[PDB]
Each structure stands twice: as C-alpha cells, then as structure tokens.
Amino acid sequence: DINDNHPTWKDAPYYINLVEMTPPDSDVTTVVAVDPDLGENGTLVYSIHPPNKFYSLNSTTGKIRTTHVMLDRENPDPVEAELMRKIIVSVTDCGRPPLKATSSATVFVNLLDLNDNDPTFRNLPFVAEILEGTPAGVSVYQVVAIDLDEGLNGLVSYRMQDFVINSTSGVVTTTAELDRERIAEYQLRVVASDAGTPTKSSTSTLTVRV
Ligand SMILES: [Ca+2]
Ligand SMILES: [Ca+2]
Ligand SMILES: [Ca+2]
Ligand code: NA
C-alpha cells in the first residue's frame, strides 16, 4: 500500500523532427516514464505544463499530438517560436500521497521547412524617374524581394514579360535610346521566383517615367 517510488523519465531528453503546417491531431512522439509500484502507486498521468497551444497529450498513453493551432517555421513572434520547438512535460503517479518525478522532461522539436511562403517585394511597386535620350546598357532600378523560407526555398531570382532585368542581382538595364515621343511611360511586370521544386512566384509593377 506504500508509494515506494517516484515516476522516472526514460530516454529523456527527446529530439523529434516535425514538418511545419502538419495537420491537426497528427502524431509527434510518445514520452515514457517508469514506476514499478503496483496499483495506483504506479498508474501514471502525463501533462504539458506550462501549457503549449501547439501540442496536446494523452494523459494515460503519454502520446503527444498537434492541435488546430498550425506550426509556422516563419512565425516572427519569439514567444511562439520557442513553444513550437520546446514541449515541457510533467508526470505523476495516482498513489497516496501522489508523487511527481523530481523534474520535468523537455521534447525538442525540429521544425522542417515547406515552401509555404512566396517572395514579397521590399522596393516594389515603385515609379523610377529618368530623362529622355538615356542610351542602352544603363541601370535605372535594382528590384529587391525577400522570401522568409529556408535555404533554396528562400532564394529569390528575377524575370520579366526596351529593358532587361539581371535574374541574380535584380538590376533593371535599358536596351535602346529612350524618347518621350515613342513611349513616355513603361509598365514592367517583374516576376520574383524562389528555388523550390514547386517554384512560387510574386509579380509587381516598375513604372518608368521619361
Ligand atoms: Ca510510485
Ligand atoms: Ca516555410
Ligand atoms: Ca518560398
Ligand atoms: Na510558414
């Protein structure tokens, strides 16, 4: 009848890979604690404490799941960033008196990246001011767009659809002597792409006035 043992954590700390945006109620991992006491003196109750809005836990099986709060690798908030990557877990037996394990157990989640973000322009849309009789091979603008994704998924390149844009630099160069009487205003649709295998794009207008 004496509660002879505390619960004892097993293979802690835990390190786990999880893709971001993983659907709600998707399995993450199963935390495990040991207590050889018979009856309620060894019956365990797991719990996430402090509470984590990105994960739920089966009190009896110690099995963690995701919630209707999606996991976002590009979430700018430092408070959330940590919750998404660190799950602190408390356990107790149901004995008389009830005993906790003498410390919690951290689950370290590694958030794997999806190409879920598209490029977004820093300096577009814009209106570039130029004087007529500007000869060919003159830079007028340099387009900048950023992608919050990781590695190749965040690497932004530039394309169009009387000018040419260098795909690496985002620099916009002329190909002819510009004249007010031929075309005084150009609307140029610059398409910014990333390097994901399902490539994501983003278009905005550079308005050249002569
Ligand atoms: Ca016990
Ligand atoms: Ca992403
Ligand atoms: Ca991207
Ligand atoms: Na994201």
Swiss-Prot record:
Q: Where in the cell is it found?
A: Cell membrane
The UniProt entry's coiled-coil ranges are none
The positions flagged as glycosylation sites are N41, N58, N166
Expression by tissue: In adult animals relatively high levels of expression are found in testis, skeletal muscle, heart, eye and thymus, and lower expression in kidney, lung and brain. Found in the sensory hair cells of the inner ear.
Cadherin domain: residues covered = 10-121, 122-210
Domain characteristics, as noted in the entry: Three calcium ions are usually bound at the interface of each cadherin domain and rigidify the connections, imparting a strong curvature to the full-length ectodomain.
How it assembles, according to the record, is: Interacts with USH1C and USH1G. antiparallel heterodimer with PCDH15. Isoform C1: Interacts with CAMSAP3; leading to inhibit CAMSAP3 ability to induce microtubule bundle formation.
Its function, per the record, reads: Cadherins are calcium-dependent cell adhesion proteins. They preferentially interact with themselves in a homophilic manner in connecting cells. CDH23 is required for establishing and/or maintaining the proper organization of the stereocilia bundle of hair cells in the cochlea and the vestibule during late embryonic/early postnatal development. It is part of the functional network formed by USH1C, USH1G, CDH23 and MYO7A that mediates mechanotransduction in cochlear hair cells. Required for normal hearing.
Q: Which disease is it linked to?
A: Defects in Cdh23 are the cause of waltzer (v) phenotype. Waltzer mice are characterized by deafness and vestibular dysfunction due to degeneration of the neuroepithelium within the inner ear.
User: What protein name applies here?
Assistant: Cadherin-23
The organism that produces this protein has a lineage beginning with:
Eukaryota, Metazoa, Chordata, Craniata, Vertebrata
Q: Which gene encodes it?
A: Cdh23
